[PDB]
Amino acid sequence: GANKTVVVTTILESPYVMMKKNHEMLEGNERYEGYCVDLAAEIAKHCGFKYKLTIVGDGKYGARDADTKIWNGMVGELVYGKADIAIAPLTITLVREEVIDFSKPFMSLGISIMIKKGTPIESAEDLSKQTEIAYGTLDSGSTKEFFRRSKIAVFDKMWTYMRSAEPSVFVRTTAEGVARVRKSKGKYAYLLESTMNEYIEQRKPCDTMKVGGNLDSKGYGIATPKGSSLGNAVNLAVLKLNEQGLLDKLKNKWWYDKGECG
Amino acid sequence: GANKTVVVTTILESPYVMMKKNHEMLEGNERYEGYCVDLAAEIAKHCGFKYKLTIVGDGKYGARDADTKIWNGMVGELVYGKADIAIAPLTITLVREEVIDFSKPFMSLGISIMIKKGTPIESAEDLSKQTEIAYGTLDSGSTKEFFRRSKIAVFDKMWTYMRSAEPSVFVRTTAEGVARVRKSKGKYAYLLESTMNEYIEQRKPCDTMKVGGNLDSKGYGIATPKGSSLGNAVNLAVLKLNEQGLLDKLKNKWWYDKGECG
Ligand SMILES: N[C@@H](Cn1c(=O)[nH]c(=O)c2cocc21)C(=O)O
Numbered sequence: 012g013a014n015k016t017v018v019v020t021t022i023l024e025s026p027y028v029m030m031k032k033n034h035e036m037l038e039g040n041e042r043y044e045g046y047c048v049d050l051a052a053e054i055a056k057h058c059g060f061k062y063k064l065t066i067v068g069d070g071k072y073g074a075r076d077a078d079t080k081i082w083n084g085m086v087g088e089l090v091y092g093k094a095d096i097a098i099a100p101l102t103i104t105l106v107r108e109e110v111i112d113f114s115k116p117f118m119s120l121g122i123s124i125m126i127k128k129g130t131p132i133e134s135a136e137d138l139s140k141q142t143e144i145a146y147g148t149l150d151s152g153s154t155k156e157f158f159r160r161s162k163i164a165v166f167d168k169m170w171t172y173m174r175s176a177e178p179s180v181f182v183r184t185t186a187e188g189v190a191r192v193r194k195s196k197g198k199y200a201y202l203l204e205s206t207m208n209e210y211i212e213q214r215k216p217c218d219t220m221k222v223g224g225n226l227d228s229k230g231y232g233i234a235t236p237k238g239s240s241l242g243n244a245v246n247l248a249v250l251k252l253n254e255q256g257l258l259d260k261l262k263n264k265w266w267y268d269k270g271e272c273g
Numbered sequence: 274g275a276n277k278t279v280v281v282t283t284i285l286e287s288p289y290v291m292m293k294k295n296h297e298m299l300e301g302n303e304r305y306e307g308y309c310v311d312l313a314a315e316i317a318k319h320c321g322f323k324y325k326l327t328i329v330g331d332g333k334y335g336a337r338d339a340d341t342k343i344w345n346g347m348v349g350e351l352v353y354g355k356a357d358i359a360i361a362p363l364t365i366t367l368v369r370e371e372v373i374d375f376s377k378p379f380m381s382l383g384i385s386i387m388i389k390k391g392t393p394i395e396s397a398e399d400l401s402k403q404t405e406i407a408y409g410t411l412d413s414g415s416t417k418e419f420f421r422r423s424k425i426a427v428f429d430k431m432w433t434y435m436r437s438a439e440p441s442v443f444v445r446t447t448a449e450g451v452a453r454v455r456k457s458k459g460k461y462a463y464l465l466e467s468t469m470n471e472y473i474e475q476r477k478p479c480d481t482m483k484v485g486g487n488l489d490s491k492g493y494g495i496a497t498p499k500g501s502s503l504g505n506a507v508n509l510a511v512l513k514l515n516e517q518g519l520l521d522k523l524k525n526k527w528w529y530d531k532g533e534c535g
């Protein structure tokens with residue numbers, strides 16, 4: 012039948028998607044800005060569709076409840092037909108790949124350590140061998156799931172520590188994790204995706220840093236419902252944008268051109 | 274119908290696939306060793322297929338002749354039905370994605386600069402601004418195609434330099450490029466994939482190094498003919514192996530555990 016406007020699901024997470032300061036004077040997609048807003052515009056331009064940015068209702072990326080078998084988050088919105096495409100910092104994982112389609116990665120990343128400057132930690136092994144410096148992750152998402160599911164000795168030890176540490180080492184949002192690092196006088200380290208770690212390192216008050224190698228090597232992908240015709244074109248668009256250098260340009264724009272730490 | 278042995282196409286390129294020193298005393302898949310040999314075994318274990326490693330007849334990765342429209346290399350073997358899967362350091366690119374299926378990446382990489390130690394070059398921009406130190410790429414493959422197709426000023430300038438430089442700055446094999454760096458007294462720099470650059474930096478006589486940031490960010494993928502049923506399972510296997518840390522283990526095994534430079 013006739014073309015329809017493509018429903019995009021995304022999530023408010025700086026610098027990927029933010030409401031503009033003047034959003035009340037704007038309408039529709041123009042209310043938002045960020046890396047994923049720019050990426051959505053480029054994908055739509057190359058694929059020739061009109062689209063509407065919507066914000067995922069439950070604030071989650073995507074996981075399946077073990078009891079009800081229901082998928083939540085942006086993955087769920089795709090699985091249940093509430094959105095046509097997810098354009099967000101959504102990690103390509105096996106369990107998600109089984110239920111939705113993903114483009115090839117538009118950004119590479121790995122789990123990483125954020126410390127307050129001066130914290131005597133250089134690696135995941137360092138954290139795992141001690142408890143004076145508490146450490147944790149988001150309470151939902153692929154970083155938490157990495158530790159929960161790991162059979163690698165160091166990361167399994169870290170997960171056992173995280174589950175049993177008091178007070179809770181988990182946080183609900185990136186902002187909460189960053190604030191906790193900044194306010195804990197070196198006694199909290201935050202495990203988060205390297206992309207986000209790099210972004211925060213260039214934000215005032217310039218008191219955090221990424222330390223150590225990444226713990227894994229993953230990618231973010233554009234997601235569509237399994238079998239959706241849109242998937243092929245969107246994937247070719249990601250590859251084209253990468254080959255043209257435009258994904259690198261967008262990362263530089265949102266991470267470094269605007270950096271606040273010199 | 275009944276299960277059939279899966280025909281794998283690959284290419285002799287160290288450390289991905291090499292003939293064992295004692296290969297004459299061995300048969301079948303046991304004649305070969307390397308990262309991609311180990312990876313093929315893990316993929317087959319997880320997917321439950323038997324397979325035969327074969328070596329691509331024409332020694333190429335995969336490109337389409339502009340006049341005849343015929344695909345060569347491992348891509349061609351898939352397109353024309355001569356192999357069922359390609360397991361090799363095969364870069365995911367747009368033009369290839371249009372004709373074959375690719376798994377999500379099993380290895381990340383970018384184009385990079387190899388110098389003989391002491392060469393006064395730190396970046397692609399450095400190379401592009403001069404001619405005393407000649408520089409080039411393989412005469413076939415995705416690294417050459419990156420420069421040929423680039424509309425980025427620095428890389429377009431480098432391509433124009435490479436096409437017009439005398440004597441020819443192109444090489445036919447990785448070994449030829451490495452040898453040329455080693456024998457040219459600092460007057461040749463080799464543009465190659467970062468993975469390979471890192472491998473060579475750990476090989477005697479320990480006289481090369483990787484310099485500068487990568488020029489792009491790409492991945493190697495396992496390839497199957499478009500629409501092949503094997504593609505889904507193989508892709509899930511790559512993701513599982515990545516999530517288990519086994520791809521990192523294989524890279525360490527073939528790059529660093531065996532490193533010859535300390
Ligand atoms: N990418 C993850 C969600 N996520 C995460 O787990 N850790 C982080 O530090 C993140 C920053 O932005 C999004 C993030 C997923 O897809 O679940």
Ligand SMILES: N[C@@H](Cn1c(=O)[nH]c(=O)c2cocc21)C(=O)O
Nearest residue numbers: 334362363364414415416465466
């Ligand atoms: N990955 C490339 C082929 N290739 C390449 O172009 N440059 C290199 O330095 C390589 C090392 O191994 C394979 C390589 C393709 O798929 O064409």
Ligand SMILES: [Cl-]
Nearest residue numbers: 014015016017
């Ligand atoms: Cl509509």
Ligand SMILES: [Cl-]
Nearest residue numbers: 162163164165
């Ligand atoms: Cl282990």
Ligand SMILES: [Cl-]
Nearest residue numbers: 276277278279
């Ligand atoms: Cl057979």
Ligand SMILES: [Cl-]
Nearest residue numbers: 424425426427
């Ligand atoms: Cl440019």
Ligand SMILES: [Li+]
Nearest residue numbers: 108109111112
């Ligand atoms: Li999928």
Ligand SMILES: [Li+]
Nearest residue numbers: 370371373374
């Ligand atoms: Li494809």
